[PDB]
Known about the structure:
This is 2-amino-4-hydroxy-6-hydroxymethyldihydropteridine pyrophosphokinase. It is an enzyme of class 2 (transferase). Keywords: ATP-binding, Folate biosynthesis, Kinase, Nucleotide-binding, Transferase. By secondary structure, this protein is of the alpha+beta class. The chain is built from four helices and eight strands. The protein has helices at about 15-25, 65-80, 120-130, 145-150; strands spanning about 1-10, 30-35, 40, 55-60, 95-100, 105, 110-115, 155. Strands 1, 2, 3, 4, 5 and 8 form a six-stranded antiparallel beta sheet that branches. The chain has a two-stranded antiparallel ribbon with strand order 6-7. The longest helix has 15 residues, at about 65-80.
Amino acid sequence: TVAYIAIGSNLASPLEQVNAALKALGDIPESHILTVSSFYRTPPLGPQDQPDYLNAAVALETSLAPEELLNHTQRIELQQGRVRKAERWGPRTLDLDIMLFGNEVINTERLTVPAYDMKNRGFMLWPLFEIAPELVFPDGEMLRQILHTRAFDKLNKW
């Protein structure tokens, strides 16, 4: 199954944090990284003297159950992020989001797929479009269509 994961990092030097995250992702059991989008850039939240967020999309082939994949993304966030020496929601941390899992729709307390409100998030949709231009959501909605009809903030590459 092809799962699509969104990477978000505004910690230290994002470039090497995203690279450490990609290595962790590729080490996930029963999983193989198909492709990685270009790195995209978004402004910090709060003080503007912060680092920009580095955003990216990853196509990951996997035989893991959705919840098993979530387990590992959550583990990597803890191991790579700064949760121990900071806060869970800490300003500068690592975000791994399961945007899509095959053509599956998952509505449960622990995991929502497609990721809730991702269709309104350009920093997720644009990188996803770069690696999967023909992508269609489970509800039949085409990615290319959403990008033509919804208003998004400007998204420059890193």
